[PDB]
Design a protein around this ligand. Structure first.
Ligand code: HC4
Length: 125
């Protein structure tokens, strides 16, 4: 298993060296989005939590198609502000409840070391 802890201060650096294969070895959910909320990466742990198949949601827009419970001021609003500002680093609990059993998770959104990409990290609480 890849050894990186959820909430690590230098996680964006560690994950920059990871392909889809290594991202799947994380102990927590990991989603990479572009500026518009499109899914570039989606790991196995994220799939075990959300139920959806990794390979089928890549390409999809996270806020419009895949995950609406997130289209609101407390998740999407925070993400859109971060994108426009060029800086993003926030952590909060939330509840995923679309087409699945209501699940409490802890989310960490952070701008990737890369240009126009952003990370969404999920774990159970
Ligand atoms: C609330 O809906 C949050 C996240 C989420 C992620 C994946 C799927 O499939 C549903 C919901």
């Amino acid at each position: 298993m890849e050894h990186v802890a959820f909430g690590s201060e230098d996680i964006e650096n560690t994950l920059a060296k990871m392909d889809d294969g290594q991202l799947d070895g994380l102990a927590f959910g990991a989603i990479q989005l572009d500026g518009d909320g499109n899914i570039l990466q989606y790991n196995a742990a994220e799939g075990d939590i959300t139920g959806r198949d990794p390979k089928q949601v890549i390409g999809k827009n996270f806020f419009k198609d895949v995950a609406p419970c997130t289209d609101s001021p407390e998740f999407y609003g925070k993400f859109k502000e971060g994108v426009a500002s060029g800086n993003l680093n926030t952590m909060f609990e939330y509840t995923f409840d679309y087409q699945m059993t209501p699940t409490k998770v802890k989310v960490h959104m952070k701008k990737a070391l890369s240009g126009d990409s952003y990370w969404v990290f999920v774990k159970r609480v």
